[PDB]
């Protein structure tokens, strides 16, 4: 969500929805969330509650 954006659209390509259950959602903040694909995050400078 860009800073001061009031809309974020999602487009998911056409694929099966076999055995689909609900959705959930919540909002986070960029500075507080590191990626788990990477082993280290040089840009992650926060040590509070994730």
């Amino acid at each position: 969500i860009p800073a001061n954006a009031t809309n974020v659209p999602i487009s998911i390509p056409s694929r099966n929805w076999a055995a689909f259950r609900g959705w959930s959602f919540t909002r986070l903040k960029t500075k507080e969330t590191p990626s788990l694909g990477s082993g280290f995050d040089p840009y992650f400078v926060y040590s509070g509650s994730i």
């Binding site: 259950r21 609900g22 959705w23």
Partner: peptide, 17 residues
């Protein structure tokens, strides 16, 4: 969703082996 659980107890001391 958040919830999803389907692992829970459904429960010479032997028959045949």
């Amino acid at each position: 969703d958040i919830n999803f659980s389907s692992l829970a107890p459904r429960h010479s001391d032997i028959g045949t082996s």
